[PDB]
Design a binder for this molecule. Sequence first.
Ligand code: HEM
Ligand code: HEM
Ligand SMILES: *[C@@H]1O[C@H](CO)[C@@H](O[C@@H]2O[C@H](CO)[C@@H](O[C@@H]3O[C@H](CO)[C@@H](O)[C@H](O)[C@@H]3O)[C@H](O)[C@H]2NC(C)=O)[C@H](O)[C@H]1NC(C)=O
Ligand SMILES: *[C@@H]1O[C@H](CO)[C@@H](O[C@@H]2O[C@H](CO)[C@@H](O[C@@H]3O[C@H](CO)[C@@H](O)[C@H](O)[C@@H]3O)[C@H](O)[C@H]2NC(C)=O)[C@H](O)[C@H]1NC(C)=O
Lengths: 190, 190
Amino acid sequence: QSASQFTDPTTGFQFTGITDPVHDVTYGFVFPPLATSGAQSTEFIGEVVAPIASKWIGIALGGAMNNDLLLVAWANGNQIVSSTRWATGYVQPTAYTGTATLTTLPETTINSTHWKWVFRCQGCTEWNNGGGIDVTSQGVLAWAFSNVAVDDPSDPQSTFSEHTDFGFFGIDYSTAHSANYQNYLNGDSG
Amino acid sequence: QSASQFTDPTTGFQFTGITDPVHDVTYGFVFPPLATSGAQSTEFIGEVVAPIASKWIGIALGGAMNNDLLLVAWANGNQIVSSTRWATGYVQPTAYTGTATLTTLPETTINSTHWKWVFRCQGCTEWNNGGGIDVTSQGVLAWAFSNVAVDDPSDPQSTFSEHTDFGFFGIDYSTAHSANYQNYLNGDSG
Ligand code: HEM
Ligand code: HEM
Ligand SMILES: *[C@@H]1O[C@H](CO)[C@@H](O[C@@H]2O[C@H](CO)[C@@H](O[C@@H]3O[C@H](CO)[C@@H](O)[C@H](O)[C@@H]3O)[C@H](O)[C@H]2NC(C)=O)[C@H](O)[C@H]1NC(C)=O
Ligand SMILES: *[C@@H]1O[C@H](CO)[C@@H](O[C@@H]2O[C@H](CO)[C@@H](O[C@@H]3O[C@H](CO)[C@@H](O)[C@H](O)[C@@H]3O)[C@H](O)[C@H]2NC(C)=O)[C@H](O)[C@H]1NC(C)=O
């Protein structure tokens, strides 16, 4: 599949991403402006908009299960529970030990039909194994879905069973940056 | 997703198609030589290679559930049961009302881990509503998966419940034609 540009109609945040038509989950990503001098930013903002039947969602930021930073999240009542994880060998991903801070942003909304997780991921483009993503280039992201609850919903490091579905999409990171990024951080669409 | 060319590692048949990594089902298509002085053939040869947990598989020849020719198949014991179907509004597809002949080819196998349906589909590129596919250009195919048995597996027109997954892939039909098509019909890889 291929990502495209879209706007969140309630927040006005502009993302790059996709909606999976099977589970009707939307994945969106937006990056701070590219730099002219120096290193690129290592953070981005993302969103997951999922029907409540979605019991947990994962994002594989290198587009594969193993050897890349994983984001996992689920609704626990009126709360989003989330973590950064890492996997080797196709087994239960465990707590990431690198430098990454996953922040739930105030736009996050949970209602009777959907959970909408809006997050900031600082340090998430470069991982402690030396890999990461090139925000000037084209790459692949992947998502993982389950309709079965995690083993302990109040624990961010809960174990859980393998996803019931997973999928991929191409993304042109060079067109995924926004001049309004800082405004998103202040809760402004611009 | 995107189709590519591949070779059946048992028969040597060359197909165009994909392997869905989630359910590990391979979908393959091959067409007769392109004509330039006549209208195109309306038939093709296809294959479904599916792990036994796949209780039914559908192929949507126009890339969508409704108003296009669908192919549905499942293993019942040591035999493949299959049908041509049609749907008008996201409900149980029923028997196609046009002229189309689905023939199981002898390369078809069923064993303990997989069922492999190799078939001939005559009258399958042009449909009795005036629609169809253009085998000289680019199009989209779709598939449907379920891991729940059909209601009555010995009946080709059995009802069943909605797929648990579905997906799409782009296919360049202009690249999917083969000089070996007639050989395939005779059971030869050529
Ligand atoms: C105990 C939990 C998990 C188990 C046992 C597990 C197991 C597996 C297995 C066996 C596969 C191969 C499937 C195939 O190709 O047929 C796979 C694929 C994959 N998994 Fe998981 N998984 C789990 C959690 C996760 C998480 C939480 C994520 C993302 C945050 C994820 C992302 C993926 C992706 C993207 C693939 C396909 C690409 C690749 O093969 O790496 N998995 N997983
Ligand atoms: C009793 C059986 C079936 C029911 C109730 C049914 C129902 C549905 C529904 C409700 C959707 C929309 C899902 C969404 O977008 O969230 C859908 C999509 C789809 N269905 Fe089915 N389905 C069934 C059988 C089949 C079969 C046999 C095929 C293929 C031979 C098929 C192919 C598709 C495809 C490819 C899509 C996605 C594209 C589209 O929206 O047209 N369906 N189906
Ligand atoms: C729970 O939250 C979800 C996600 O925010 C709500 O679905 C979203 O509802 C908005 C309506 O504010 C939809 O936005 C668009 O609104 C315009 C109105 O001009 C309309 O023209 C568009 O067709 C579209 O509806 C948005 O599409 C929709 N998103 C999804 C994924 O369904 C949902 O309504 C909330 N549920 C409750 C009970 O409040
Ligand atoms: C049950 O049916 C399945 C599906 O046809 C069989 O799996 C397939 O078996 C072939 C034969 O060994 C596999 O071989 C491949 O062979 C080529 C030819 O040299 C080789 O280059 C490839 O690297 C590969 O090893 C084929 O991959 C495999 N396909 C799938 C989807 O599993 C299975 O062997 C059958 N079981 C029995 C007991 O007959």
